[PDB]
Amino acid sequence: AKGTNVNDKVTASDFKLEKTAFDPNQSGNTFMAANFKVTGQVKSGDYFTAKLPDSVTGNGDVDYSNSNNTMPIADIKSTNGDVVAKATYDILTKTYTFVFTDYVNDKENINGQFSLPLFTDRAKAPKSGTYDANINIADEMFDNKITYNYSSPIAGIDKPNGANISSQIIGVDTASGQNTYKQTVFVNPKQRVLGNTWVYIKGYQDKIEESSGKVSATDTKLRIFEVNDTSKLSDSYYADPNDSNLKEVTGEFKDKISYKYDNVASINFGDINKTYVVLVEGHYDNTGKNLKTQVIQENIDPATGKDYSIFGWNNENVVRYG
Amino acid sequence: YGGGSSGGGSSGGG
Ligand SMILES: [Mg+2]
């Protein structure tokens, strides 16, 4: 159910952001907290909402797209554990909706409170910086600013011919049961001159038995895009496959990708001199083991045939609650 | 040789 929108009966207050600056590339995030109050009375079905600007999201790197873009949210209660309201959040509209239950039918001057995780929006806010973060609760605007200090994905050896590669897991499907994940790898973020270049996507880090991840030809799809202008790349790891700045070249790799070795995939980039982006759609198992991963690149050559090198990179994500 | 990054998100209480 869900009847009336009682925003006008509702007035939030005591709003604070746990903190106003963080690095979302090291599991940075914050929380919005607040008290609310119901001038008057209501009934099962009424509801109020909260809405988030472009800058933040309410699900961060947990994907819900395979769940009708709907994020369950732990119930709102009284002290006897009585479920006062049921809550959820729409990934698309960035709308929290709290819908009362069989509890409100006999009370007035109602008071509750929430605390809700807030994460960056990697598409909306793709470059380190300060953004307007005006949050709406029950038609009242609460204004803030968020600074994102992304750990530059431009990372690798300090050598002119040094292997350099980074990557992030930017969406994980915990809810649907499909157990999918989305990961952006950047190969040659430094856009150096690189010889016989090799890449590896692992479903684990040092220990297989320590990660749920699974990387096989059957569990894993890969799309590769030559970048036009590296500077135009996101600090956030988001990559829009439809950016003109990216040219999908997945068709140049039919015979350069191997799922031979366990929980790994290898691409043969060859002789390259600019950045490439790899979209990973993969899956992890029901082991409950955390999803940990690592990508590595090595290059030989270039114009010497010696001074070979290698650089690696690790991912895992963290879960918060509201 | 290597580095790293980690991410974060909400399970939705579940
Ligand atoms: Mg394999």
Numbering used by the authors:
A (entry chain A): 210 to 531
B (entry chain Q): 8 to 21
The authors write:
ClfB, an MSCRAMM (Microbial Surface Components Recognizing Adhesive Matrix Molecules) family surface protein, described as a fibrinogen-binding clumping factor, is a key determinant of S. aureus nasal colonization, but the molecular basis for ClfB-ligand recognition remains unknown. ClfB plays a key role in establishing human nasal colonization by binding to the human type I cytokeratin 10 (CK10) expressed on squamous epithelial cells. As a bifunctional MSCRAMM, ClfB also binds to fibrinogen α (Fg α), which is assumed to be significant in platelet activation and aggregation and has been shown to contribute to the pathogenesis of experimental endocarditis in rats. In this study, we solved the crystal structures of apo-ClfB and its complexes with fibrinogen α (Fg α) and cytokeratin 10 (CK10) peptides.
To study the molecular mechanisms underlying ClfB-ligand recognition, we solved the crystal structures of ClfB(208–542) in complex with CK10 (amino acids 499–512, referred as CK10(499–512)) or Fg α (amino acids 316–328, referred as Fg α(316–328)) at 2.3 Å and 1.92 Å, respectively. In both complexes, the peptides adopt an extended conformation and are inserted into the tunnel formed between N2 and N3. Unlike Fg α(316–328), CK10(499–512) adopts a more extended conformation. In contrast with Fg α(316–328), the peptide CK10(499–512) did not induce formation of the β-strand G′ in ClfB. Nonetheless, the C-terminal portion of strand G that interacts with Fg α(316–328) also becomes well defined and caps on the CK10(499–512) peptide. Interestingly, although in the ClfB-CK10 structure the G′ strand appears disordered, the ClfBAsn238-Arg522 hydrogen bond also exists, consistent with the DLL model. In the ClfB(208–531)-CK10(499–512) complex structure, four pairs of hydrogen bonds were observed between the main chains of the peptide and the G strand of N3 domain, resulting in the formation of a parallel β-sheet. Polar groups in side chains of ClfBTrp522, and Asn524 in N3 domain form two hydrogen bonds with the hydroxyl group of CK10Ser503. The aromatic ring of ClfBTrp522 of the G strand of N3 plays an important role in anchoring the N-terminus of CK10 peptide through hydrophobic interactions with CK10Gly501 and CK10Gly502. Structural analysis showed that the space surrounding CK10Gly507 is significantly circumscribed by its neighboring residues ClfBVal528, Gly269, Val271, and Phe328.
